[PDB]
Amino acid sequence: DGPEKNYERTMAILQIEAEKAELRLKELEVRRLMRARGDGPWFHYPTIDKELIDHSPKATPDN
């Protein structure tokens, strides 16, 4: 292989690896914030569904 092919092949390798490293660091930061704040799609632990509630008039009025 000529030196230009290897040289520019190296740049393509470096770009991919560098981009993956940045994404890996963001994921650790995103995961830290989602877990601490619970304001994202991850670490979304279930709560009771409100469509299970009966809204019709009950046998007695105070409720």
Partner: protein
Amino acid sequence: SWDKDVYPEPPRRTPAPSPQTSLPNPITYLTKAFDLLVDRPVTLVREFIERQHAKNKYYYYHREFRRVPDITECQEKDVLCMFEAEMQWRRDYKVDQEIVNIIQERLKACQQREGESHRQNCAKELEQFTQVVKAYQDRYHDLGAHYSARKCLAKQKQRMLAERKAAKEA
């Protein structure tokens, strides 16, 4: 053959033969025998080979590397720029090693050429050797086996900081 400026030699001064004896010089007759029996047949063989080379003449070139931005112009962790800057620094490092080798070869050739007068007559080669070694040492010495442009720069800035402080106190 080679660039005479890069690899200088002085003008040769041979003394003409001045015999003071009647005996024949055996070296003179051996030189004639060597020229006839050794050099002449050797020259004929080379001239034949030189004819064949002329029939098939082709070229090769010296690779020229475009200058690229150096490590000082690279943003931190920007690997694409650091890579080109780092490969360039390595190429220059290999070139500076050969520059010191050229100067060392001048010094060594002068010492042999000047004979017993070498201490006086080789001063300029010695002084030039001393300077290029000093410059080479400043650039590259103590960087370690994992040297890089980044470490070279860190060393330079340390030297520059000591130079600025010394002048400040002066």
